[PDB]
A paper describes a structure:
The crystal structure of p.I340M has been determined at an unprecedented 1.9 Å resolution to improve our modeling efforts on PH1 causing mutants. The minor allele shows two single amino acid substitutions (p.P11L and p.I340M) among other genomic changes. The P11L and I340M polymorphisms are found in the dimer interface. P11L is expected to produce steric clashes with residues from the other subunit, which would explain the reduced stability and foldability of p.P11L, while I340M establishes several new favorable interactions hence explaining the stabilization observed for p.I340M, and the partial compensation of P11L destabilizing effect when they both occur in cis (i.e. the minor allele). Regarding the polymorphic variants, p.P11L and LM are kinetically destabilizing, while p.I340M enhances AGT kinetic stability compared to the WT protein, either in the apo- or the holo-form. The mutations analyzed on the minor allele occur in locations far from the dimerization interface, and with the exception of H83R, none of them are found near the active site. Modeling of Arg83 predicts a loss of interactions with PLP and the appearance of repulsions with surrounding residues, likely affecting the orientation of PLP (and/or PMP), which could explain the low catalytic activity, altered PLP/PMP binding mode and low stability as holo-protein of H83R. A295T, P319L and A368T substitutions are found in the vicinity of the domain:domain interface of AGT monomer, and cause an increase in the size of the side chain. Interestingly, these three mutations show more pronounced apo-AGT destabilization and deleterious effects in CHO cells (as total and soluble AGT protein levels) as closer the substitution is to the domain interface (P319L>A295T≥A368T), suggesting that a fine tuning of interactions in AGT domain:domain interface may be important for apo AGT kinetic stability and intracellular stability and foldability.
Residue numbers in the entry:
A (entry chain B), B (entry chain A): 4 to 388
The structure:
C-alpha cells in the first residue's frame, strides 16, 4: 500500500553555493547579464518568440564561427554531445576515420568513432604536440578517410593547432574536416568558411561564458551531402541531424516537434552571443592574446616553465604549466582554492600528472584575474618550499 | 583578415521575452524559487559542492520515483534523451523489444529501438487506448522480449495507463519493464520499486516545474545486470551508463570526468525537487486530481467533449479535448494566445488534428488557471460563432 521513501532532509534545507573564481579550463564564471537571463520566466518551447530567439542565436553562431552555412544550430547537450552529433551523422559503419590523437579530445573522438562502427585511424602524438600539413597528408594518403578530426584548441595540453591549409588538403583527398573549437572559439582566430572547415563545433561554457549544457555546431554543404545520403539511419534519434535541422529552421519544411529545447539555457546562450557581437570577434581575440601574454610573463617570473615551449603554439584560453619537480600538484590546486577561493586544474588524459591548467575565458580573461591566480600560485609554491 | 560575417544587428538589441501563461502539456511556468536558482553564479563542475548538490538531487529522484535503486541519476538532456539512454544501454542489436505504441511516445520508442538494431514489436492501439494485463502477456508470450516499453502518462492522448501488475507479469517472462513517466511524475500515483519497474524516467519541465533540458532516470539491479553484462558497447558515449553511473557517484570508484554537467540547470532541478519534497507526493497527487476534475466539468459546460471517455483513464496533468465540429482548432489556439496570453496546444502524433491539449502541471495546476483557460476558450469559441 504505502510509501517506501520519505522526503530527503537535505532538500528541506535552502540551496547555498560558495563563491568561486573559476580560472581553470572551464566552465567560467558568468557575467551579470548572463546570470540575469538565466533567472527569467519560461515561454512556449515552440512559440513564435522562441523561434525568433533561436534565429538570433543561429545568426550569432554564424558570426562567431564566421560561416554562411545554413545548417548551423545548437545541440541540446554539452561539448561531447556536439562531437557525438557530428560523428553519428557523418560516419556510417566501416567508414575510415582519421583522428588527431594528441590529447584527450582526440582520444574521445576515437572512442565515439569506435562505438559507431567506424574504422578508426589515430595519428598519435605526445601531449604538447600538434599536426603538420605533411603528417595529415600522409594519413590521408594511407587511410583514405571520409572524415578527419582535429582539435583546434587542445585544452588538455595547452596547444593551439594551426588550421590554415588543412581543409583544402582534406578536400583534395575527398575527406571532410571536423574541428573541435570548444576551447578556442572567441579566444583565437578561427574562420570556418575561409579555412575550408566542414564541421565545426564549440561549447557554451568556455570563452562564451554561458552555463554548460549546450553546444554550437555548423556543417558545410559537403558535410550535409554525406549526412543526407546515408544507407542507414544514425544510431541516435536525439541527435539525428535531419530532425534537428528541421526544428532549427534550416530547411523548407515547417518546424516539427523533435525534442524540447532548453529554453532558459537558450536565453543565456543568446546573451553570451550578444556580448561577443558587441565586443567584436577581433577585439575578443586581442583581449585573450594580451591576457595570455601577461600570464605567461608572470608565470616565468615565478620560475615556472610553460608546458608548450613555442609561444606560437600556446592556446591563449588554456595555459599548461609544467609541474615543478619535487612539488605536489594536488596540494598546489588545493592551496589555491582553500586560501584564495580560486579554481585551477591539473591535467587531463595524457597530460594528467604533468601539468597545471589555467583558463582565461571571455570576460574572465583579465589582467586582474591573472594577478589573482599568480598571487595564489606564488603563495602555494612558497608554503610548499 | 576579411571577416565574412558582421555582428548580427538582431543581437545588438535587448533580449525580449513575452509574458505567457503556459497551460499546454509542458514546459510549464517556473515558480520564484526556481527562477532564482537559475540566476545564480557558477561553481566548479567537479567541485565537492557540486557533488553534494548532485547527491541531494539523487535523493530527490529516489523520493519522487519511490525507489532505493543506487543507479539513479540525471541525464544531461531532455525527456527524449533519457528514453534514448535507457534503450541504447539496455538493448543490444538483435534483442527483442516489445512496445506499447498507443501514442507518440511509443512511436518514438519504436523509432529509437529500430535505430539501435533491436527487433522491435509494437502493440499498436488507436489514440485513447491503453493496455490490459492480458494484452501485454499476449505480447510477452509471442515475442519473448528482453524489454517492454509502456507510457505511464500518455500526454499526446490524455490517457493514464494502469501500472499495477505489469512489472510482476514482465518478470515472469524474464522481461524488464521500462516506463515513461515524463508527464505523470508528481501528478498521479507512481511507485517504482513497489510496482516492479526496472527502468523509470521522467523529465524536468512537466509537473516538477523546472526548466526543460534535464531528465531523471533510475534502473533496478536487474536492469543494471543487463547493461553491465552486454558484450558490445552502447552506440553512445555521451549516454554510456557505465561512465554516467561513475560520475554520478553510483559506483565504488572515484568520480572520473565524463562530460560537463549542466551546473545551473542542476541548481534549478534541485530546487524543483525541494519544492515537491516540502509539499509531499500524496498532496501533489491530490492537488492535480482536484484541478483536473474542476477542469473537466468546465470544459463539458462549454459543450466540449473530453477525448478520453472513462474518467478513470484520464491523465490529470494533460487533458485531451475533442476538437468540436465546425470549429478551426488552429484559430482557437491562436485566439487564446492573442487575446489572453495563454498557451494551449493541439494534438501530437496520432492525435494530431483531433484534439486540444490542456496541461495542469505542478504549481500551475490551480483552480485559478482552470478558470483562466476556460474563460479564454469560451471567448475563442464564441468568436468563431
Ligand atoms: C514531453 C514528453 C516526452 C519528451 O520530453 P522532451 O523533453 O520534449 O524530450 C516524453 N514522454 C512524455 C510522456 C512527455 O510528455
Ligand atoms: C571542455 C571541452 C570539451 C568537452 O566539453 P563538455 O561540455 O565537458 O562535454 C571538448 N573539447 C574541448 C577542447 C574542451 O575544452
Amino acid at each position: 500500500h504505502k510509501l517506501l521513501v520519505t522526503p530527503p532532509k537535505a532538500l528541506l534545507k535552502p540551496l547555498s553555493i560558495p563563491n568561486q573564481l573559476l580560472l581553470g579550463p572551464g566552465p567560467s564564471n558568468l557575467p551579470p547579464r548572463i546570470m540575469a537571463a538565466g533567472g527569467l520566466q519560461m515561454i512556449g518551447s515552440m512559440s513564435k518568440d522562441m523561434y525568433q530567439i533561436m534565429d538570433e542565436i543561429k545568426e550569432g553562431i554564424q558570426y562567431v564561427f564566421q560561416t554562411r552555412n545554413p545548417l548551423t544550430l545548437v545541440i541540446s547537450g554539452s561539448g561531447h554531445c556536439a562531437l557525438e552529433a557530428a560523428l553519428v551523422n557523418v560516419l556510417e559503419p566501416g567508414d575510415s576515420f582519421l583522428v588527431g590523437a594528441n590529447g584527450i579530445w582526440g582520444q574521445r573522438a576515437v572512442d565515439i568513432g569506435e562505438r559507431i562502427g567506424a574504422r578508426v585511424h589515430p595519428m598519435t602524438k605526445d601531449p604538447g604536440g600538434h599536426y603538420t600539413l605533411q603528417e595529415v597528408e600522409e594519413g590521408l594518403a594511407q587511410h583514405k578517410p571520409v572524415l578527419l578530426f582535429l582539435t583546434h584548441g587542445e585544452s588538455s595540453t595547452g596547444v593551439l593547432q594551426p588550421l590554415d591549409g588543412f581543409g583544402e588538403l582534406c578536400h583534395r583527398y575527398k575527406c571532410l574536416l571536423l574541428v573541435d573549437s570548444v576551447a578556442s572559439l572567441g579566444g583565437t582566430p578561427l574562420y570556418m568558411d575561409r579555412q575550408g572547415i566542414d564541421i565545426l563545433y564549440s561549447g557554451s561554457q568556455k570563452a562564451l561564458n554561458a552555463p554548460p549544457g549546450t553546444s554550437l555546431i555548423s556543417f558545410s554543404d559537403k558535410a550535409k551531402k554525406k549526412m543526407y545520403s546515408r544507407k542507414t539511419k544514425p544510431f541516435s534519434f536525439y541527435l539525428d541531424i535531419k530532425w534537428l535541422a528541421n526544428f532549427w529552421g534550416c530547411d523548407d519544411q515547417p518546424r516539427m516537434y523533435h525534442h524540447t529545447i532548453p529554453v532558459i539555457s537558450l536565453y543565456s546562450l543568446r546573451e553570451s552571443l550578444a556580448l561577443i557581437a558587441e565586443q567584436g570577434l577581433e577585439n575578443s581575440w586581442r583581449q585573450h592574446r594580451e591576457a595570455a601574454a601577461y600570464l605567461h610573463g608572470r608565470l616565468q617570473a615565478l620560475g615556472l616553465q610553460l608546458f608548450v615551449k613555442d609561444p606560437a603554439l600556446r592556446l591563449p584560453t588554456v595555459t599548461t604549466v609544467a609541474v615543478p619537480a619535487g612539488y605536489d600538484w594536488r596540494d598546489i590546486v588545493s592551496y589555491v582554492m582553500d586560501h584564495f577561493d580560486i579554481e585551477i586544474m591539473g591535467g587531463l588524459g595524457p597530460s594528467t600528472g604533468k601539468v597545471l591548467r589555467i583558463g582565461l575565458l571571455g570576460c574572465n580573461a583579465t589582467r586582474e584575474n591573472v594577478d589573482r591566480v599568480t598571487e595564489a600560485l606564488r603563495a602555494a609554491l612558497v608554503a610548499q618550499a
